[PDB]
Structures are given as C-alpha cells and as structure tokens.
Design a protein around this ligand. Structure first.
Ligand SMILES: *NS(=O)(=O)OC[C@H]1C[C@@H](Nc2ccnc3cc(-c4cccc(SC(F)(F)F)c4)nn23)[C@H](O)[C@@H]1O
Lengths: 76, 972
C-alpha cells in the first residue's frame, strides 16, 4: 500500500509499505528518501508518536494515510 | 523598513511582504480577549493602520483574557480604553477607534476586516458578503471555553506568492541527458518534490536553458529528477546549478454563507477530525440559541440549555445535510460540553487563536504563506480536571464577581484557587517568557497565599526585542528583561503584586549555589522559555534530578512545538535527538567555497583574527612572562603599526591585495584553471577563482577598506568617523602595491622566527583594544566588514554577493522570530499546564504540539512513556529512577552495598570526565582507592556548596552479564 509522509516544511514523501512493516523499517525508507537518520525522525499519526518495535497496523495506519514528520524548534 | 526594530521578523516574512503589509489598513471588530490578542500581534508586525471597533462597556468578567483592561476601566467603552495601550506597541502603526459601524459601507476603507466573538452570525454573514463582493479580505474567529474556531475568506481571486517561506532549493548538476534526466553531483540531494519548478545557470552546452526559463520537476530518486526533453536546447557538456522557483498560485474562497452549508476544513488535530463537523453545527447553534434568548448564551453548566443546544444541532444537521454526511449522528456529549462552556473565556485558547488569526491577517495583506482554507475548529477538552477531584456544576462554576469568572465558568472555583497556589519557575523572560507571564497574569497563577512565580533571565532589553516581546517599551531598552516583565504583569493583574520574584541569574552549572536543592524542591513545576538547546538540556536534567514536571516549547519563524515532561511517566527532553547543525568541510572554507555561507564564515573568522584574537594575543604577550605557530606571526605583524587613520587605510588596502589577489594567484599557481585530476580539477564544488583588481567604485572593495581601516583604528585607539570615495582615493592612489611572487614550496590541502618579536620592555603601557562582535549596532563597522569581506571572496569565486541583512542573518546566527507563533505556542503550553494542576497520570491526556503557521499545519501527539528496564528481574525507570546513597561512602562499602542490596558487581565508576574505579584495576591502584570516601576519591583524581554528587556506573548482574543501570546520587 501507498502512504504519505508530510514534513513540517510542506514536503510530501510517498512510501510503499505493508500493514505489518515495523516503524523502524518505515524510518529506514524515510532515511533513503530524505537522508534523516531514524533516531532524528519524529513521526506522528492520529494523536500518537510512532515508536520502534511496533508496526503500522498497531497504529491503525491504513492505505493513503498521512504521517507527519515533525521537529523541535530552538528559538524562544 | 526599519531593520533595527524588525530584524528578527524580517527573516520570517521578507521585505516584499512587509512592504505590502505597510500599505494595509486592518479593521478588528470586537475587543474582548480574542480581538485584543489578534490586534497586539498585528500592530507588532506592522501594518499601515489598525482600526478597532468595540463600543460595548467594560465589565469585570472581560478581564479574564483582556490583558489591556483594568478594574478602573469598568463602564468605559472597550475600544476607547484599549486603543491607547495598542498604540504603545508600535509607534509606526496608527491606532484608531471606529465609533459606530451603522453604515456597512465604511468597511470600504479597509483591506482586511476581522470579526471576533462580539459579532453575531447574522452580522458576520452580512459583513462577509459586503467584503467578498467588494474585494475586502474577511476573517472571523470565536472562542467558547475550551473550544474555538476561525473562518478565512480572501475573495474570488487571491494570489499566493510564496506558499511556505522556505529557502528555495539549489544544487550542483553533473549531467543533463536529452530526455531531461538531471543527475546531481556526487552525493548531493536535490530535496525537490514532484511539481516543483526550477531554473538553471552555468549549464554549458545548453545555452538558452540558462535564461530564467522554468522547468517542471519529476523526481526519480533522491539524486535525480527529470525536466522533460532538452534535445532542442543543445547537448550537455559540463557544470550547472539548479535553483528552485516558487510560482504564484491563484486561489478562490467561498463566502461565509456558502461555507456554512458546505464547509471546507483544515484540522487542528487529526485524532479529532470527526469533531470538526460537529463543532461547526455547534457554533452555529450557539448563535441561534442567543437569537432565541434575547442575546444570551446557554447558562453555565446548565443541563436544560444543553438539551436545547443538542436539539438545535440535530435540527441544523437536517437543514445542512452535507456537514455531517449520511448516517452520522449528533455527538451529544460534545455539544453538551460546548453549551456548558459557552460563556468561558480561557487564556490558552484565546492565545492559540490570537496568534493563528493574526498570522492569517498578515497572509491576507501580503500573499506570503498559504492561507487557511477555510474553517478550523479546535478543542482542548483534555484540559478539564477529573470531576472526582474538582466537580463541575452550577454551584462550583458560578460567578463570584471576579476577573476570573469566565475561567471559573469552565473549571470551577476550587480548581481556580489551586492554579493560584502553584509555585512555578520560568527560565527566560524573552518572547516566550513575556507571553507566558501575560498568560499567568490572566490565570492568577501564583497569586494565592501558597503560590508564587520565579522568573529569571540574565539579559537586558534591546531594540530588536520589542517587535515580539510585548511587555517591553522603547523606554525600557537597557533595563533587565525579567524585572521589567514582572512589573508589567503586576500592572495587568494586581493580584500578582509581591508574588513574582524577578531574578537576573543565568541558569547553568555556575549558579547551582543560588538555584540549590531547596529552591527546586519547593516548586510545583518548571517552564522553559529559552533560545538554546544546551540551556534546555540543562533544565531538563535538573527537572529529572528533582522529579519536577517541565513545560517545554520553542519557535522558529512560523514553526513551533510544545513538549510535556512528567515525573515517572514520560521520557524527558534529552531522551530524543534533533538534527545537529551541519559542519562545513575545512578545505571548502579555506580554498573551495561555492555558497555565500562559506564566504561569510571565512569573513567572520578573518574579522575575529584581525580585530579580536590579534589584539588579545598582543595584550597577553606584553603582560605575561609565561607566554612562549600562527600566533607568533600575528604578534609581529601587529607590532611592526599605525600612527594615524591614513595608516589604517593603507593596511586595509594591503590586506585587500593579500586576500583577494595574492592568495588567489597562489592557489591558481598550485591548481591552474586548466588542471586535471581524467576530469578537470576545477569542477562541481571547486570553482576556478579570478584575482580581484581593486576598484574603489566597487561597493564591496570600498567598504572592505573603510570597515577594515575603521576597525584597525579602533584596535590602536585611533579616532575614526558617510565615507567619501575621493578621501580614501587621496590615500590609496599614492600607494605602491607589492607584486605577487609565488611560493613554490606551499602545499595546499585538497580534501579534509620567535626572537623577531620586540621586547615588551620597549612597549610599556601599550595595549590593543579587542573588538567584541556586536551584530545589532549598525554604526560599529562589524557587519559592514563581514559583508564586504565575504562579498570580495564571493567575487573571487563567482558566487552571487549578499547584502548586509543576509550576511547579518548568517554571521549573527539570528533565529527568525515573530509574535504570532510565540503567542500561539505559549497558549498551547498553558492548555497543558491545566493537566499538571490536576496531576494527571494518564499519559493519553497530555499533548505534545507541533505547528507551522505558514501551511497552516497543526498536529499533536501523546508523549512517549519513559522506557523501563530490568536487572536481576528488578524493574526500574530508565529516565526517572536512580540509586540514592546516604553519606560520603567509602568505595569498598559502595561496591559491597551494590553486591548485597542490588546483586550488581560494579565494573566501572565515574564522576564527570574522571574515572574513579574499574574492575580491571591492579592491586596497587585499588589499595590507594578502595578505602577512601567518594569526595577523597574524587580529590585524588583531580567544594563547600556541594550537597550531592552524581556518579555513573557500569555493572554486571548475578548471572555475570553487563546490564544497563541508572545513575547514583551520593547525598553528602
Ligand atoms: N526566544 S527569545 O525571544 O530570544 O528569548 C529567549 C530568552 C532566554 C534567555 N536565556 C536564558 C535565561 C535564563 N537562563 C539561561 C541560561 C542560558 C544558557 C544559554 C546557553 C548555555 C547555558 S549553560 C547550560 F547550557 F545551561 F549548561 C545557559 N540562557 N538562559 C535569553 O536571555 C532570552 O531573553
């Protein structure tokens, strides 16, 4: 299935994934496409942050779902 | 555009947007908390004029969120009272009161009309229709307790000039095939997305491809994209730089009337997407209720009125069938809470929408960023305390004739009193700090007999701060941030008099005597208001150590985030990593720049060397007997010496020759323009430079000398001080410029004597004045030098030159910042703060927030639970647990204690960077160590203030294997 990742800058990334893929594996696919090391990725979906060792289906991530790649900002 | 006021905001919006905003007249209807908050952010940002309309009399309950109202204003008109206080925010912005809006045709004078919660739905429809049909931008917003909405209608044809505000992508090209497949140089990522547009420069063999023509991008992996056929353009030879171009987008908005029946939503929270359509009917039902009950909203906590609102929503879903869609029921419980809270006026919610709506105003003026299209609904129902702890009914939520009545309306009297009795520490008194303190003033947080606020900041108020730190005025420049902010919020809410301790101390390892065990232990929680990652890490480690909740937040232009850290529940701030700042290769800096960032960093280092380090090294050489390879050469140059300003000019002219002519010739001697590796040496990132021939009519050449001379004159105490070209010519024209002679024995890296010095005896009393880099003083020549110096090197390497504003951004390391995002994220922090007050232990109630107002995007996620671990089947919290050890224990006893109590063999013991014990140590080292108390053991390897010592350990479990274990705290 196809899912989408939107960055905080507005960029959309398209990923081919299976329901049973781990979050670690989705992050590896993001690293290939974007260069961001998995440890620096914060993915959020439907009020949850996606953690390693769980699967997409654990978070009810469906086909055509959008995940948000988000950031922490330093200014204040 | 006044750079000295608008500096930080200019980096968010750009000159063109701010020029357009400065032609825009804005009208705001309604000046309760929501209207004043929007007005504050808009006035600070700088529009042509601000007009406010609110002829309603001030009542006590208005002060819940209206921070410009005082108890003495009661009876007077909201508009009139607020106008004078708004005017103070930005002297460049005229603030007027509209006395009546009898004629809807008066609206013709304005570019943007904002209707707040004082305007009926009926009137909003009429006003919107006038605006839409006349080409006037219309925005509305209303907040009702923990709920809120906004509607944007920018008319039939609105042009977005820049959808995101992100820096355009650029990159180096190594190939363009005839089908238009563009390959990136080496491992450079293009970062482009399908449907982006690029233009080209320096693509040899395809000539007209470089004329500014735009090409649509089809992405084929991270190192390639296609632009379609290029056969007709020629054949690709070498080189090339793509630059992303943002194309204009025409967008169409529907009128409020059409959008009431068929709304288009942006979601605030995807976990709650279903609620948006429910609240859309809810908010409409509230207006219908007010129509039926002589202008009155539902009674607070009233079950009878709630049932009427539910019936109103049920009836409206029939009239508006496309809102909920087929088979979807009225969410009765949600509508019930809306009715229950309708009269509420909550600071956090007011701040969230105040920030967001103000940004939408700025978009409507400028065509900068993507407008909200067209409705957004928000709730923060998780902020509600457990009804078991603080019951909500008509008795507990009743007015007690108090400024807090419309907060009591939501939370009840007892919860309100608990807010008052909180003891809090705020680290930082800048943008976030000011917004925080205002919010806390409005809450009456720390005003109760058991409560207080401690705010600390070491910094003073500067002009550029005033654009986003709204508690400060031009009169306050030079005074301390914390002290001024404390006084300003006491004037806003007298309940805080004698309750804020404004300190000027910098939180860090060096002020632990002030911020000691006693100080932290007393606190209920800590709030960050910082601008530095290390500062945040430091505070986070203290909150972990003392087991205190931390409220974290941050901004960068239109981007923002909030994080909650809860003892024994969540991970902390330091538990996760953010992208590090990217490091430029040393060889790229030294010899091979290809971006303005490279020439700026080189110029800044040169600035440092010439005017700071040089002066310091001389001063140390002349006063320090101990003093005695690059350093030595600088001292001799500094001391073999100007007697007047003319000598400083000569020196800078000669530096020009050295840096931008001689050194370049030397590099080209080593690597001629034609040199080859197969391929040419000067390709991709390596751009074949050309030596500069000094031309005083070139602005960069001229200002290098002016600023270099003026700075050298400062070093040597020579009187300095627009510069005249002919005056400088009358020095330079008479100079003999030494010819270049190549050093044959100089190696240049491709990829990443002593008694000549004069006797300090002969130069007694002589001292150099070192320059302290000051980016925000445009008269000191600092940015002038760095800009000119960078630009001359940019000229060497055919890099496009930058102006002073861009150079200052990069060399000054300035964080883009604007009041809109600041007030919004602070609002979100205060909605989490309610959960801390109720001591919520359910992780699913808390929300970390993530925003980008440019898009606009709002997203929330539940915090990550603290990772748990085990040793010898004993479970522990990897963030929150530690081994507490009483007394200055002897090493052997410590080792004994861990074997006996924990079943752990200590394999390694450390204090900071010092290793204290290891299981591989030999008997001789062990004998001098094992019988010492920890302080003495630390003394052997290397203070009275110190009450605790933190130790790190590696350990093996009972079954012999290594095991992750928490730190040790020795209590002395
Ligand atoms: N976002 S803003 O508008 O620029 O306002 C930000 C505030 C934050 C203040 N800084 C501040 C206040 C109180 N204590 C500290 C400590 C530090 C700090 C910074 C860097 C390193 C260290 S040492 C370490 F990391 F803690 F170990 C401490 N900054 N603080 C600013 O003054 C501004 O007003």
């Amino acid at each position: 299935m196809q899912i989408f990742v939107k960055t905080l800058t507005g960029k959309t990334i398209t990923l081919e994934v299976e329901s049973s893929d781990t979050i670690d594996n989705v992050k590896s696919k993001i690293q290939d496409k974007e260069g961001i090391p998995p440890d620096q990725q914060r993915l959020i979906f439907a009020g949850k942050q996606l953690e390693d060792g769980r699967t997409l289906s654990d978070y009810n991530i469906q086909k055509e779902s959008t995940l948000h790649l988000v950031l922490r900002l330093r200014g204040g | 555009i006044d750079e000295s006021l608008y500096s930080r905001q200019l980096y968010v919006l750009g000159k063109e947007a701010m020029l357009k905003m400065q032609t825009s007249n804005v009208l705001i209807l309604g000046l309760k908390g929501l209207g004043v908050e929007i007005a504050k952010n808009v006035v600070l940002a700088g529009v042509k004029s601000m007009t406010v309309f609110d002829p309603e009399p001030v009542q006590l309950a208005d002060l819940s969120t209206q921070f410009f109202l005082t108890e003495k204003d009661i009876g007077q008109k909201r508009g009139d009272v607020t106008r004078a206080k708004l005017a103070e925010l930005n002297a460049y912005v005229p603030v007027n009161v509209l006395d009546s809006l009898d004629d809807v045709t008066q609206l013709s004078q304005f570019q943007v009309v904002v209707a707040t919660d004082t305007v009926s739905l009926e009137d909003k429809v009429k006003i919107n229709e006038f605006c839409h049909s006349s080409g006037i931008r219309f925005i509305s917003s209303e907040t009702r307790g923990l709920f809120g909405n906004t509607f944007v209608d920018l008319g039939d044809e609105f042009t977005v000039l820049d959808p995101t505000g992100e820096e355009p992508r650029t990159g180096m090209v190594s190939d363009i095939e005839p089908d238009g497949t563009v390959t990136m140089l080496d491992d450079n990522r293009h970062g482009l997305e399908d449907g982006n547009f690029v233009r080209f420069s320096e693509v040899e063999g395809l000539d007209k491809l470089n004329d500014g023509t735009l090409f649509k991008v089809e992405v084929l992996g991270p190192f390639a994209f296609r632009i379609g056929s290029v056969k007709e353009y020629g054949e690709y030879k070498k080189g090339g730089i793509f630059t992303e171009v943002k194309v204009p987008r025409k967008i169409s908005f529907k009128s409020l009337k059409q959008q009431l029946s068929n709304p288009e939503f942006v979601f605030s929270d995807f976990a709650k997407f279903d609620r948006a359509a429910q609240l859309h009917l809810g908010f409409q039902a509230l207006h219908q209720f007010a129509v039926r009950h002589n202008g009155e909203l539902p009674r607070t906590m009233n079950d009878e009125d709630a049932n009427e609102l539910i019936k109103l929503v049920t009836d409206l879903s029939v009239q508006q069938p496309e809102v909920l869609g087929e088979g979807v029921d009225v969410n009765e419980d949600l509508i019930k809470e809306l009715s229950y809270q309708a009269r509420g006026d909550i600071p956090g919610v007011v701040a969230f929408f105040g920030g967001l709506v103000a940004q939408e105003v700025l978009k409507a003026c400028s065509g900068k960023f993507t407008p909200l299209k067209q409705f957004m609904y928000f709730d923060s129902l998780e902020s509600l305390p457990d009804p078991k702890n603080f019951p909500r009914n008509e008795k507990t939520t009743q007015p007690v004739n108090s400024r807090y009545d419309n907060q009591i309306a939501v939370f009840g009297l007892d919860f309100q009193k608990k807010i008052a009795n909180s003891k809090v520490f705020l680290v930082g008194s800048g943008a976030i700090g000011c917004e925080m303190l205002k919010n806390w003033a409005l809450l009456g947080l720390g005003s109760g007999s058991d409560g207080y606020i401690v705010v600390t900041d070491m910094d003073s108020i500067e002009k550029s701060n005033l654009n986003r730190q709204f508690l400060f005025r031009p009169k306050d420049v030079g005074k301390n941030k914390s002290e001024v902010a404390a006084e300003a919020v006491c004037a806003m809410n007298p309940d805080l008099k004698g309750k804020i301790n404004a300190k000027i101390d910098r939180v860090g390892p060096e002020t632990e005597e002030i911020f000691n065990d006693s100080f932290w232990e007393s606190l209920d929680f800590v709030t960050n208001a910082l601008d530095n990652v290390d500062a945040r890490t430091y505070v986070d480690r203290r909150c972990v150590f003392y087991r205190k909740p931390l409220l974290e937040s941050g901004t960068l232009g239109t981007k923002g985030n909030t994080q909650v850290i809860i003892p024994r529940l969540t991970e902390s701030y330091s538990s996760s990593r953010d992208p590090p700042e990217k490091s430029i290769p040393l060889c790229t800096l030294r010899s091979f720049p290809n971006k303005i960032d490279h020439t700026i960093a080189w110029a800044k280092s040169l600035f440092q060397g010439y005017f700071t380090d040089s002066a310091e090294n001389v001063n140390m050489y002349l006063t320090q007997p101990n003093f005695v390879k690059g350093v030595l050469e600088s001292i001799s140059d500094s001391l073999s010496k100007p007697h007047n300003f003319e000598d400083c000019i000569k020196w800078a002219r000669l530096e020009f020759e050295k840096k931008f002519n001689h050194d370049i010739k030397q590099l080209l001697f080593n690597f001629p323009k034609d040199a080859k590796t197969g391929e040419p040496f000067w390709s991709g990132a390596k751009r074949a430079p050309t030596p500069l021939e000094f031309d005083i009519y070139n602005n960069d050449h001229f200002h290098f000398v002016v600023a270099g001379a003026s700075l050298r004159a400062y070093n040597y105490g020579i009187k300095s001080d627009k510069p005249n070209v002919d005056e400088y010519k009358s020095v330079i024209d008479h100079m003999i410029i030494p010819e270049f002679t190549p050093n044959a024995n100089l190696k240049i890296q491709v990829n990443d004597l002593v008694s000549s010095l004069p006797d300090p005896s002969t130069l007694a009393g002589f001292k150099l004045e070192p320059v302290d880099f000051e980016k925000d003083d445009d008269t000191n020549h600092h940015i002038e030098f760095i800009t000119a110096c960078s630009n001359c090197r940019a000229q060497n390497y055919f890099i496009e030159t930058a102006d002073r504003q861009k150079t200052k951004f990069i060399a000054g390391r300035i964080i883009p910042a604007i009041a809109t995002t600041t007030s919004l994220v602070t609002g979100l922090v205060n909605l989490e703060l309610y959960k801390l007050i109720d001591n919520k232990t359910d992780i699913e109630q808390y929300k970390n927030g993530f925003v980008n107002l440019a898009l606009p995007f709002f997203g929330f996620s539940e915090p990550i639970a603290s990772p748990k671990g085990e040793y010898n089947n004993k479970k522990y919290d990897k963030i929150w647990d530690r081994f507490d050890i009483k007394g200055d224990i002897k090493l052997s006893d410590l080792i004994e204690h861990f074997e006996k109590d924990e079943g752990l063999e200590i394999t390694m013991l450390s204090y900071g960077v010092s290793l204290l014990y290891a299981s591989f140590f030999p008997p001789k080292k062990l004998k001098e160590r094992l019988n010492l108390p920890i302080t003495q053991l630390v003394k052997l390897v290397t203070p009275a203030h110190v009450s605790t010592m933190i130790l790190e350990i590696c350990a093996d479990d009972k079954e012999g294997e290594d095991v992750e274990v928490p730190f040790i705290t020795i209590h002395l």
